[PDB]
């Protein structure tokens, strides 16, 4: 009863490879193409919101989620696989950083954590790895804005800009074409709009598309007043409008 | 009642009557002499028609309420409304167990349709008893003779009220810890009816 599977559910191929992992990237690469761009002024990530039904209210799910007010990320993979991670991801941050450090981690460590997680999901018995990889937008003071891609392998690494999921390649291609060090976010946004529209086969609009940025600290979102030090979240999700707005900025 | 949590005091009393049961208590919550909250609502819903008078530590009772209520809720979410008794059963455990951690006397009063109102005492002893009516809390002392004499069964809705109100006021008068205002709550076939009575009323009875 219980679990009698304690043994690593992925094993070294005769080639040493880990098939399930290598199978995960499949479903990972399967993911609805999601992009991210670390700009000068900030970071923006984007992906199309895939509705399985108009009855289904697309907005009611979010393929991007803030982790810390300056950090949010997107995935390509199973929405569920995306689901629980953030909870931990958010949770661990408070616990394993904030509740220690009274503040929100440098994205790197926050990144570092979930990477470790999936490795467990990789190596642990009775478990499989997750079906998502993670484009991670974050800004911390000393490390500034940060753009991180993480796999079910937990393999993680920075980007200047990037995309994952289904059509990521030609996007990244177009991105690499498009990208410069100096990309302004709206540019990058527009760029992503360009970029994502490419990977967007279905309806392309704000309601169909998910854009979030790491912007400036957002005192409008401070939700209180009278604390100078706290200037709000840097992370921001753009509106369908702001998209549809910037979709006219196309 | 650990040091630093607030002291309810007053006197909690509930009377099953001709239409059901009514709960009553004072609103006064004292810290030593200092009434912390004079307006406190000490009568409490574990269940729509099943209710409780809380004495002992609020922090005890206050939590205790959430507990049983949570269960009854879930229980109801499963098996529907438990009996008013069935709720106290839940309490009885807690009391009869955590009693050594627990300061709660509780009148469990609830209206069943079938059985009309149901008074259930749970002193801190973890013992449980159904009564025609119950009184507890500080001034309950002074008024035992009063209530006992001046109680009757199937008293009308109001007969319950002021006799209780007198009972309470006496306690409130007599007790220092009993006061604020009289909150009464009627549990009948009709339903839950919360009542309030201001000192300028019940002080004079």
């Amino acid at each position: 009863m219980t679990d009698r599977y304690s043994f690593s559910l992925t094993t070294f191929s005769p080639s040493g490879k880990l098939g399930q992992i290598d199978y995960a990237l499949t479903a990972v690469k399967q993911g609805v193409t999601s992009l991210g761009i670390k700009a000068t002024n900030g970071v923006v990530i984007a992906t199309e919101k895939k509705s399985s039904s108009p009855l289904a209210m697309s907005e009611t799910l979010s393929k991007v989620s803030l982790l810390t007010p300056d950090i949010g990320a997107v995935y390509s993979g199973m929405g569920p696989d995306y689901r629980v991670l953030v909870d931990k991801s958010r949770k661990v941050a408070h616990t394993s950083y904030k509740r220690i450090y009274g503040e929100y981690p440098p994205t790197k460590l926050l990144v570092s954590e979930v990477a470790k997680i999936m490795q467990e999901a990789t190596q642990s018995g009775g478990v499989r790895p997750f079906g998502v990889s993670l484009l991670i937008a974050g800004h911390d003071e000393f490390n500034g804005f940060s753009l991180y891609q993480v796999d079910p392998s937990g393999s993680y690494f920075p980007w200047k800009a990037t995309a994952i999921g289904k059509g990521s390649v030609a996007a990244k291609t177009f991105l690499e074409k498009r990208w410069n060090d100096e990309l302004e976010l709206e540019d990058a946004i527009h760029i992503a709009l360009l970029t994502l529209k490419e990977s967007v086969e279905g309806e392309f609009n704000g309601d169909t598309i998910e854009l979030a940025i790491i912007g400036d600290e957002n005192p409008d979102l401070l939700g209180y007043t009278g604390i100078p030090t706290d200037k709000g979240p840097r992370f921001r999700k753009l509106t369908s409008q702001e998209i549809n707005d910037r979709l006219e900025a196309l | 009642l650990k040091k630093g949590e607030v002291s309810l005091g007053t006197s909690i009393m509930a009377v099953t009557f001709k239409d059901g049961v009514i709960l009553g208590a004072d609103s006064r919550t004292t810290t030593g002499a200092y009434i912390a909250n004079r307006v406190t609502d000490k009568l409490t819903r574990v269940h729509d028609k099943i209710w409780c008078c809380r004495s002992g530590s609020a922090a005890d009772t206050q939590a205790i309420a959430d507990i049983v209520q949570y269960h009854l809720e879930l229980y109801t979410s499963q098996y529907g409304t438990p009996s008013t008794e069935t709720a106290a059963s839940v309490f009885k455990e807690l009391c009869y167990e955590n009693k050594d951690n627990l300061t709660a006397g509780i009148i469990v009063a609830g209206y069943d349709d079938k059985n009309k109102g149901e008074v259930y005492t749970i002193p801190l002893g973890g013992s449980v008893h159904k009564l025609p009516y119950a009184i507890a809390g500080s001034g309950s002392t002074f008024i035992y003779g009063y209530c006992d004499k001046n109680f009757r069964e199937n008293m009308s809705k109001e007969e319950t009220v002021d006799f209780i109100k007198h009972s309470l006021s006496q306690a409130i008068k007599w007790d220092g810890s009993s006061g604020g205002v009289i909150r009464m709550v009627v549990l009948t076939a009709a339903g839950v009816e919360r009542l309030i009575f201001y000192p300028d009323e019940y002080e004079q009875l």
């Binding site: 219980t2 679990d3 009698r4 599977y5 559910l9 098939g19 399930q20 199978y23 995960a24 990237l25 499949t26 479903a27 990972v28 399967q30 399985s52 039904s53 108009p54 009855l55 289904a56 209210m57 697309s58 907005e59 009611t60 799910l61 199973m78 929405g79 569920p80 696989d81 689901r83 629980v84 909870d87 999901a121 009775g126 478990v127 499989r128 790895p129 997750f130 079906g131 | 959430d66 507990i67 209520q69 949570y70 269960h71 809720e73 879930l74 979410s77 499963q78």
Partner: protein, 243 residues
């Protein structure tokens, strides 16, 4: 190896066949059902199928009242049905107990959503072959429809149906909603919403229903609930009046 289908592990494609097969178990009960957010309300209708006399037919529901506010319809086997509601039952009071206010519907969904993803990821854990749709009229979100899958995947719905013939009513309402253009059925009497539904259930199912034919429930503000056969009959009568 080929166990990849027997168990939850990424297929060579990164696919989970038990999941995909749990999906089979979903309509394996072959009950078609719907969830429609009325204007005020949310209403859920389903096929009450009474194959036997020896049944106590009354006992038969896949629509389950989760909370005060929240009910849910199950699409899937009654053991697995009876399970998740139980599972759901806890979280509510739990949430409420913990959080002092009742659980919002989707929270349960998101909650219950988490659950299979576990079993999805938890090999020995099998996911459940029930499809679940939670509904309430949320103090925040008002009328609400949240359907979840054996995969822990879930979303909000302007409305939904579910069952073998789901697509049909799906089209129907999609037709009617693309028609009606508003997320909810706009009716103040859930009755109408029901009557609307039973129509559009009768409509897309092309299927007239007796009052014993229908599992019928209504999520209303602060109270999810269902109907007796008579409100159903009332509808059957009421719906027989529009037509």
């Amino acid at each position: 190896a080929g166990y990849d289908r027997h168990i939850t592990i990424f297929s060579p494609e990164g696919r989970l066949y038990q999941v995909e097969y749990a999906f089979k178990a979903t309509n394996q009960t072959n009950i078609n059902s719907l969830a429609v957010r009325g204007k005020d309300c949310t209403v859920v209708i389903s096929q009450k199928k009474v194959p036997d006399k020896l049944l106590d037919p009354t006992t038969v529901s896949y629509i389950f009242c989760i909370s005060r506010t929240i009910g849910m319809v199950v699409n899937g086997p009654i053991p697995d049905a009876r399970n998740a509601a139980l599972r759901a039952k806890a979280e509510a009071a739990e949430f409420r107990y913990k959080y002092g206010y009742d659980m919002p519907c989707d929270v349960l969904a998101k909650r219950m959503a988490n659950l299979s993803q576990i079993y999805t990821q938890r090999a020995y854990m099998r996911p459940l072959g029930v499809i679940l749709t939670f509904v309430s009229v949320d103090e925040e979100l008002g009328p609400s429809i949240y359907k979840t899958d054996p995969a822990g995947y879930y979303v909000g719905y302007k409305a939904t149906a579910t069952g073998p013939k789901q697509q049909e009513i799906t089209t129907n309402l999609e037709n009617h909603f693309k028609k009606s253009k508003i997320d909810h059925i706009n009716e103040e009497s859930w009755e109408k919403v029901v009557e609307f539904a039973i129509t559009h259930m009768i409509d897309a199912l092309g299927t007239e229903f007796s009052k014993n034919d229908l599992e019928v429930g209504v999520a209303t503000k602060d109270k999810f609930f269902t109907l007796s056969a008579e409100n159903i009959e009332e509808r059957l009568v009421a719906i027989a009046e529009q037509d």
